[PDB]
Design a protein around this ligand. Sequence first.
Ligand SMILES: *C/C=C(C)/C=C/C=C(C)/C=C/C1=C(C)CCCC1(C)C
Length: 227
Amino acid sequence: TGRPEWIWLALGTALMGLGVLYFLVKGMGVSDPDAKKFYAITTLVPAIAFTMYLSMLLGYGLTMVPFGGEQNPIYWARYADWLFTTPLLLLDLALLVDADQGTILALVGADGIMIGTGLVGALTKVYSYRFVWWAISTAAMLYILYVLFFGFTSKAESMRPEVASTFKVLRNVTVVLWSAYPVVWLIGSEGAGIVPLNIETLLFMVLDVSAKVGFGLILLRSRAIFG
Ligand SMILES: *C/C=C(C)/C=C/C=C(C)/C=C/C1=C(C)CCCC1(C)C
């Protein structure tokens, strides 16, 4: 079949793969419980991305959706990855700053909406309605970034500077990477079809790997994960 984007699915599989192992090993050597908590979460994130990147490399998670007069290539496995990976990341951020149960619930729920409306949008046949769904998903994302920026940051000020520091970095990395997803989606295959599938896959692996292995590297080398 050899699709053009495959080289990127292969690089993503590999990066996600190397990251899950390194974290796994690091985490089972650690004895501190809290740190163990953070390790178990952060290692799972790329582990899942790894399976999905593998599937897509092997020909799964792809479907052709009709809209705009075309049979467009829609990688739906991505939402199968992000449905569980994005909330887990919010959780790491939530545990880092002592977020309350209610804040976490609303965050994940928001996240659930964002990924669901996003997939629904990527599956929609009427071109215009694709952007309606995309719109809701993005609005849901903004709520999440808001809580993380205004909420969390504020509560991270009750922690040690080392903890608030690790968090700001993590929060900052998240805000920049997440912000880029709706835009890639809008000018890509699910959207205006301006950017070709291959460049889009590369944009997505870069963000994905940056947001999971990048985020993890920073979180796990920090002494903030300890109780
Ligand atoms: C490891 C993957 C991560 C951290 C993925 C984050 C993904 C997003 C913030 C995705 C957002 C989307 C929208 C705001 C609307 C359109 C569809 C999505 C799912 C691409």
